């Protein structure tokens, strides 16, 4: 039986004083969760771990999220810490950024659970999602067994939650805003205040108008604007014709309709449960979704296109008949461009935007680190920038680099926008940059930020962003950014070109959710 290795010293910890197997975990049943915060499957099992953490609240048991990074941005401890906050992780987390623990145990995928005994022997090793009951069973067995031997110690752990270390988390008006939308005719900005579980509506200068989902708790409720609840929502799309806001309500696996004419919120598809349905076609909320991350609206045929980050697909909600179908993507996580939906594949797509023609849709394909164009007529896709165009299986061709074709390198882009002039704006998220893509030339240029996570409101080329993920634009040319880990809405007036500077949009009247 494998004896788990000790954690190396000068491995940083979050949510806790540094732990080790010989001093603090001796006498505990431990689940090692090998994860990385860019993995939607890693995200998919956090609620499994929350289940076990609550079930075994006052038993000698602990989850340790061994964060083994995929992307290079993910080795920075402050990146993981923002993820730990965004994801509501409260168990111990250690940044094993060079995968020492990963390799020593033989971990192959994300996520992968290693269950360790009070003595330090590895008694089970499970990979993949959908193993809540399997883990529930091992931990039960281990507990009632090693408790029979009387080798368990229920001394507390040196718990120091990161969310209890920051005064401003409660204070800031916005908590990790991710996605944006705009109503230029009536001059309104739509903010996905993700980790406040609400939707904030202001004016293009920054002035509060109305708040949808007022209690700020995580929940899943339809009804009035004060009674509604979301769960860390992400993408938004605005229906000018009917004065509606569509919400990709990611952690409820649902599509919500914010109805401003009637001041109510109603659910269009999904039901709070992560589906595993790859064809779809059912009506309204009979149809399950899976981590809808971005949503955009096509007003001619009245179609809502959903970037289904959970299943690597683009889906299509139809306003006329309330049906949600797969639109493109066969289900495998690949950077596979093909003529037909079934011969096409995405990699955790998280951003979707319609071109001015209304005939293509550009996709932030975060896990292949590429921008792609989905053909609305054929359900097929083409590669614009990034990715490994010779290997669809390759999901590790990332970096930071401007240019054309193979010269381009990105890193987990989350956000994409198509201006009415038909140029493409993206947030290279792990590079903390805004970048511009031209669809014809396929040339990508850095437009803002230095590549270094932080905050600074300077002249764009030396200014700073922290993991930006959302975009919206005016015809005047002001480009709003959702600067996520800075919990700020920036903006760039694009007219000024090489003279231009990124600013912060000060919000007037926007207060955090009552506690």
Which residues are at the interface with Na ion (CB under 5 A)?
A: 179, 235-236, 271, 285, 331, 342, 379
- Residue 232 binds: one of Na ion, Cl ion, none (C-beta under 5 to 8 A by kind): Cl ion
- Residue 271 binds: one of Cl ion, Na ion, none (C-beta under 5 to 8 A by kind): Na ion
List the alpha helices (DSSP H) in 26-171.
Answer: 40-55, 77-86, 100-105, 132-148, 168-171
The residue with its CB nearest to Na ion is 235
Residue 130: count other Cβ atoms within 10 Å of its Cβ: 13
Task: Give the nearer residue to Na ion in terms of CB position, either 97 or 415.
Answer: 415
**What residue has token string 């040319």?**
477
**Any contact of residue 232 with Cl ion (CB under 5 A)?**
yes
The site that binds Cl ion (CB under 5 A) totals a number of residues, namely 2
Task: Give the nearer residue to Cl ion in terms of CB position, either 87 or 362.
Answer: 87
Minimum Å gap between C-beta 431 and Na ion is: 20
Task: Give the nearer residue to Na ion in terms of CB position, either 107 or 354.
Answer: 354
Q: Are 349 and 293 in contact (CB under 8 A)?
A: yes
Stretch that binds Cl ion, among 73-81, 227-235, 389-397, 419-427 (CB under 5 A): 227-235
Minimum Å gap between C-beta 428 and Cl ion is: 20
SS3 content of the chain, % helix, strand, coil (to 5): 15, 35, 45
The residue with its CB nearest to Cl ion is 232
Residues from 439 through 458 that contact Cl ion (CB under 5 A): none
Minimum Å gap between C-beta 339 and Na ion is: 11
Q: Are 43 and 366 in contact (CB under 8 A)?
A: no
Q: Are 211 and 229 in contact (CB under 8 A)?
A: no
Task: Give the nearer residue to Na ion in terms of CB position, either 118 or 235.
Answer: 235
Residue 55: count other Cβ atoms within 10 Å of its Cβ: 12
Distance, in Å, from the CA atom of 394 to the CA atom of 70, rounded to the nearest integer, reads: 13
Per-residue x/- track, 57-96, Cl ion (CB under 5 A) = ------------------------------x---------
For 189, residues 6+ apart whose C-beta sits below 8 A from its C-beta are 180, 181, 182, 183, 201, 202, 203, 204, 472, 480, 489
- Residue 285 binds: one of Na ion, Cl ion, none (C-beta under 5 to 8 A by kind): Na ion
Per-residue x/- track, 186-225, Cl ion (CB under 5 A) = ----------------------------------------
For 403, residues 6+ apart whose C-beta sits below 8 A from its C-beta are 443, 444
Task: Give the nearer residue to Cl ion in terms of CB position, either 253 or 372.
Answer: 253
- The secondary structure of 337-403 as a DSSP string is --SSGGG-BBSSEEEEEE-TTSSEEEEEETTTTEEEEEETTTS-EEEEEES-TT-SS-------B-E
Which chain residues interact with Cl ion by CB under 5 A? 87, 232
């Amino acid at each position: 039986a494998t004896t788990v290795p000790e954690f190396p010293s000068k491995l940083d910890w979050l949510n806790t004083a540094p732990l080790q197997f010989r001093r603090d975990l001796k006498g505990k049943v431990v689940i090692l969760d090998f994860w990385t915060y860019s993995s939607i499957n890693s995200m998919h099992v956090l609620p499994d771990l929350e289940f076990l953490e609550k079930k075994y609240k006052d038993m000698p048991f602990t989850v340790v999220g061994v964060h083994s990074a995929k992307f290079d941005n993910e080795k920075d401890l402050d990146a993981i810490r923002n993820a730990v906050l965004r994801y509501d992780i409260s168990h111990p987390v250690v940044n094993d950024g060079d995968m020492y623990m990963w390799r020593e145990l033989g971990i192959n995928s994300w996520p992968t659970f290693a269950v360790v005994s009070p003595n330090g022997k590895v008694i089970a090793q499970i990979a993949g999602e959908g193993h809540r009951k399997d883990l529930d069973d091992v931990v039960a067995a281990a507990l009632t067994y090693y408790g029979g031997k009387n080798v368990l110690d229920s001394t507390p752990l040196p718990t120091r939650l990161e969310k209890d270390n920051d005064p401003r988390l409660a204070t800031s008006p916005l908590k990790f805003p991710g996605k944006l939308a705009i109503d230029t005719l009536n001059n309104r900005l739509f903010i996905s205040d993700s980790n406040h579980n609400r939707i904030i509506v202001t004016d293009l200068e920054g002035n509060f108008i109305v708040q949808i989902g007022s209690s700020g708790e995580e929940g899943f409720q339809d009804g009035s604007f004060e009674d509604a609840a979301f769960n860390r929502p992400q993408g938004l799309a605005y229906n000018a014709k009917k004065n509606l806001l569509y919400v990709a309500d990611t952690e409820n696996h649902a599509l919500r309709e914010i109805d401003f004419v009637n001041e109510r919120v109603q659910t269009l598809a999904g039901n709070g449960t992560k589906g595993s349905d790859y064809q779809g076609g059912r009506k309204g909320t009979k149809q399950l979704l899976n981590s809808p991350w971005d949503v955009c609206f096509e007003p001619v045929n009245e179609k809502v296109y959903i970037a289904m980050a959970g299943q690597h697909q683009i889906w299509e909600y139809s306003v006329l008949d309330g049906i949600t179908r797969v639109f493109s993507g066969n289900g495998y996580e690949r950077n596979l461009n093909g003529s037909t939906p079934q011969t096409t594949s995405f990699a955790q797509p998280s951003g979707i935007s319609l071109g001015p023609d209304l005939k293509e849709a550009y996709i932030a394909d975060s896990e292949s680190s590429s921008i792609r164009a989905l053909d609305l007529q054929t359900g097929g896709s083409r590669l614009l920038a990034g990715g490994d165009p010779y290997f669809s299986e390759n999901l590790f061709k990332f970096g930071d680099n401007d240019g054309v074709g193979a010269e381009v390198l990105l890193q987990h882009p989350l956000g994409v926008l198509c201006a009415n002039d038909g140029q493409i704006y993206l947030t290279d998220s792990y590079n903390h940059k805004i970048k511009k893509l031209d669809p014809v030339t396929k040339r990508v240029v850095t437009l803002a930020g230095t590549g270094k996570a932080g905050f600074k409101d300077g002249k764009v080329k030396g200014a700073q962003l922290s993991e930006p993920a959302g975009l919206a634009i005016t015809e005047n040319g002001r480009l709003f950014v959702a600067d996520t880990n800075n919990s700020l809405i920036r903006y760039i007036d694009l007219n000024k070109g090489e003279d231009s500077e990124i600013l912060t949009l000060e919000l007037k009247g926007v207060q955090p959710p009552t506690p």
